[PDB]
C-alpha cells in the first residue's frame, strides 16, 4: 500500500482508506497499479485528481464514478483550493513519471512550500529539463520511488535491456515469444519487438483498449496466434506452462523485470528491464534536485544514500487558519 | 516568481534561473521578498545590482558573495556596460519604490529606449516629482506592479489604514497587540504604533538588525514582554494562537494587508494597510506617465484598464552588434 498522507497538509496521494485520512481533503492518484489503489472502488465519493489516461482506466476498471474523477492535463499548472472558499490555494503540476501509461509525478506548491512526489517513476536526464523544474525553486520534501534503492542492484537502461531482448529473440526465429507482464505497463517494449521482428503482438481485449490511448504503431491484435509475440500475465511464466506451450509450438518466455527470479526452465529468460529508477539513477536525481529531505514512498523497502544531497533543513510551515478549518471534523469535537 | 526577462536586451530583473537566462547578462534585484529571489542563493556567481539596503540584506540572509553584489545608490544615474569591448552602455537610475526597506524601481535607458520597471511599489504623488521622471522622456515600456489591479478593491492610504489601527488599539489599553507581518516590511508602521502608545515593539533579532538601517526611533527590542506591541510572522495570527496567547495576557491580533482574509476569532482584525498601489493609484500613475505599453510584473494576477493612457507604440529597437556578441550563448 504505497501511498502517503502528506503531513501538515490536506493532501493524500495514492491513499484511499478514509478511516485513516482524518484531515485529508485533496486526493491524487499517480497511476493505476493495484498497490496505488488499495481501497479505491465504486464506493469512492470524493474528488480525486489524476492524468487523463489514469482517469480513463480508473473508471473503466475500478468503476469509480466519473463525477469524482478530475483529469488534469499533464505538464500544465493547475490551481486547486485548500479551503471551502478557495481563500488559500495551491498549484499542482503533473509531470510524466515515465513508469507506465498514465503515470505522473506531482509538483505541489503552496503555503507548505514546494513538494515533489514522484509516484512510481523511472528517471531520465530529460526529467530535469521539465520547465516546472528549471525555475530554481527549492524543493522542500521529495517523496521518492525507492523500489530499487539498493546499491547492490545494478540495472541497464531500458534501451539496453530491450536490446538484450532483441538479441535473444533473434536466436529463436522459429519460436513463439511469451512476454510476461503486469496488467499495465511495457506496451512500448511490445511495440519495439513487434516492429523489429515484423510480427503482431497478441494481447487481451483489456490491453488492446489501453493501447488505443498510447499512439503506438498498429501492431497489436486480439486474434489468437496472429503473431509470434504473446503478451501474457507474468505469473503465467512457469515450468508447467512451458511444457504445455511446447505441445503446440516451440516457445520461449521472457520476464522483463528487475526482480530476482530463478529461471526454472532453460527457455525462461529473466532480463533486467525495469520501470523503476535504479539506485544510481536515484542518486543522480536527488543530487540534482537537492531537496531539504527525502521520504520513501515504498514503506517496506530501503531508502538511503542521499544524506549528502540535501539542502539545509527548513522549519515546518505553519498551517493557515483557513486550511485548519477545512481539515477539521465535527467528529473530533464534543457534543 | 515575479521576475522578468526584458526582451531584446541582456537585462533581467528579479530573475535568477540561469538555465532560462541564456542571453541575459545584467541582473537586478528590486527588493528582498522571496517571490523576487526564486533561485538566488550562495551559488550565485554573476554581478548583481541592487540598492544598498537590499545588498546588505541579500548577503546577510541568502549568503550571496559580496564580490557579486553591486550596490547602487538610490536616485543617482549609473552608467553600465552592455558589452565587453568598451562600446555600448546604458544608464540605470534606481528610484524609491516605497514598498519595503531596500525597494527600488529601475529606469533603464539605452539603445532599447526608456524602460521604467517598478518592481513592487506603492504609488505616491511624490513619486512623479522625482527629477529622473520630470524631464519629459517618453517611457516605452512600463513594467508595472499589478498586484492590486482590481477596480473593485478600494484601499485607504497607508496613513488612513494606520489611523484605523490606532483607533482599534486605543480601545484595548490592557491588551498586547500582535502585528502579523512578512519577514520584511511595515517597520514604519511598528514605529508609529510604539510612539503613539508610548511602548516598545518586541521583534525577532533578524528584524531588529534591519531596523538599525532605517533611522527609526529607539523603540524596538528583542526582550520578551518588554512592550505591548509584538511583531510576529503573519502566519501565526490564527484562532489557535488566540487561545494560547489569552492564557497569558489579553491579546488582540491585527493583519495589516489588502488580502481578503476571513477572521476566525472576534479579536483578529484584518485592516487594509497595503504595500502595493491600489487600482485607482495605478491609474493615476500610468495616466501621468503615458507609456507606450504596460506589461504586468505579476503574471498570476490581472492587469488592465490603461489603454486610454498609452502613447503611440514604437517599433522594436535594433540590438547593436556588440551587444549580440555579449549575449551570445
Ligand atoms: N507489496 C506488493 N504486494 C503485492 N503486489 C504488488 C506489490 N507492489 C506492487 N505489486 C504489484 C502491483 C502491480 O500490478 C505490479 C507493478 O507494481 P510496481 O510498484 O510498479 O513495481 O506489481
Ligand atoms: N522478492 C520480491 N517479492 C515481491 N516483489 C518484488 C520482489 N522483488 C521485486 N519485487 C517487485 C518490486 C517491483 O514492484 C517489481 C519490479 O518492477 P520492474 O519494472 O519489474 O523492475 O517487482
Ligand atoms: N505567489 C506567491 N506565493 C507564495 N508567496 C508569495 C507569493 N507572492 C508573495 N508571496 C509572499 C512573499 C513575500 O514575502 C510576501 C509579500 O509579497 P508582496 O509581493 O510584496 O505582496 O508575500
Ligand atoms: N487570494 C490571494 N491569495 C494569496 N495571496 C494573495 C491573495 N490576494 C492577495 N494576495 C497577496 C498579494 C500580496 O502579496 C499580499 C498583499 O500585499 P499587502 O502589502 O499585504 O497588501 O497579499
Ligand atoms: Fe507501485
Ligand atoms: Fe512581490
Ligand atoms: Ni507501479
Ligand atoms: Ni514585495
Residue numbers in the entry:
A (entry chain L): 1 to 335
B (entry chain A): 1 to 329
Paper text:
Human SNM1B (SNM1B, Apollo, or DCLRE1B) is a 5′-to-3′ exonuclease, which was first identified as one of three vertebrate orthologues of the yeast DNA repair nuclease, PSO2 (4). SNM1B is a member of the metallo-β-lactamase (MBL) structural superfamily, of which the β-CASP (CPSF, Artemis, SNM1, PSO2) nucleic acid processing nucleases are a subfamily. All MBL type enzymes possess a characteristic α/β/β/α MBL core fold that provides a scaffold that supports the active site, which coordinates the metal ions essential for catalysis. The SNM1B sequence comprises 532 amino acids, wherein the N-terminal region (amino acids 1–332) contains the catalytic (MBL and β-CASP) domains, and the C-terminal region the protein-protein interaction regions, including the well-characterised TRF2 binding domain (amino acids 498–509).
To gain insight into the SNM1B reaction mechanism, we obtained crystal structures with relevant active site binding ligands, solving a co-crystal structure of a C-terminally truncated form of SNM1B (amino acids 1–335) with two 2′-deoxy-5′-adenosine monophosphate (AMP) molecules at the active site (denoted SNM1B (nucleotide form)). The two 2′-deoxy-5′-AMP (AMP_1 and AMP_2) molecules are bound in the active site and are arranged in a position consistent with that predicted for the terminal nucleotide products from hydrolysis of a ssDNA substrate. The first nucleotide (AMP_1) is bound in a well-defined pocket formed in the cleft between the MBL and β-CASP domains. The 5′-phosphate group is located at the base of this pocket, and makes extensive protein interactions, including seven hydrogen bonds via the main chain amides of S258 and D275, the sidechain hydroxyls of Y182, T257, S258 and S274, and a single positively charged sidechain of K186. Whilst the ribose sugar does not appear to form any direct protein interactions, binding of the adenine base is stabilized by stacking with the guanidium sidechains of R301 and R259, involving cation-π type interactions. The 5′-phosphate group of AMP_2 is located where the phosphodiester bond is predicted to be, prior to substrate cleavage. Two 5′-phosphate oxygen atoms (O1 and O3) of AMP_2 coordinate to one of the metal ions, whilst the third phosphate oxygen is positioned to form a hydrogen bond / electrostatic interaction with NE2 of imidazole sidechain of H276 (motif B; β-CASP domain). Although we cannot be sure of the Fe/Ni distribution between the two sites, analysis of related metal ion binding sites led us to model a Ni2+ at the M1 site (according to canonical MBL nomenclature), coordinated by H31 and H33 (motif 2; MBL domain), H99 (motif 3; MBL domain), D120 (motif 4; MBL domain), and a water molecule. The second metal ion (M2 site) was modelled as an Fe; it is coordinated in an octahedral arrangement by D35A and H36A (motif 2; MBL domain), D120 (motif 4; MBL domain), an oxygen (O1) of the 5′-phosphate group of AMP_2, and two water molecules.
